Amino acid sequence: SGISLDNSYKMDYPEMGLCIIINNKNFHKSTGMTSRSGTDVDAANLRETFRNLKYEVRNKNDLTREEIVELMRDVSKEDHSKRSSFVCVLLSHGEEGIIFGTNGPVDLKKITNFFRGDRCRSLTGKPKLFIIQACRGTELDCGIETHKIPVEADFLYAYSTAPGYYSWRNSKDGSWFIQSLCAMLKQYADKLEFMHILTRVNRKVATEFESFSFDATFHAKKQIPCINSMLTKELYFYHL
């Protein structure tokens, strides 16, 4: 044959993979967590956006911390042999390292570990994407006017906000991070490598949103998402 190169993840398996969207809007009264108004906008837009990329989307809504873990354990035991990648979107409350089911928290690690290269063989060496719209702490950004591969390899964490910070959601328009994520896939999935799309998403969230509140503490705050890439090749949502 000719000279070959292997800098990109193989994305021409018969199927792109599963997109799991976990949309948690209403929380058990006993936890003291408010309903996450507007997250249905986020859920519908993701579904539509990942449909266009040819992912097999499964929306789940108002899952308990047990149903979250069981869903993920079940999904990690399916046979992904014919699938190119795996995407999982978590829409919910949280703290650093943690996402809330409707009745209490789940550590992100417990979820992701299900897909470690050694625990989910049919996904070994395929890109596993985790998109997290949740709080990562309580800080507010005031802005300024202008043994062959690691088990942990091949993950990409697309964080809505920086470590330790609040994540912003609009009750009519959806969450800043997700509006921008879907817009930028619409417009750039057939042109840009994923890392360059997230960078666009970063710039949009950072440049075009400023919170508005009657409460001095919460008014005029900003957000910058966090890309955590343990990927080992470049990731394009198209193939040749």
Partner: peptide
């Protein structure tokens, strides 16, 4: 606008 609300925080999650």
């Amino acid at each position: 606008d609300e925080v999650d």
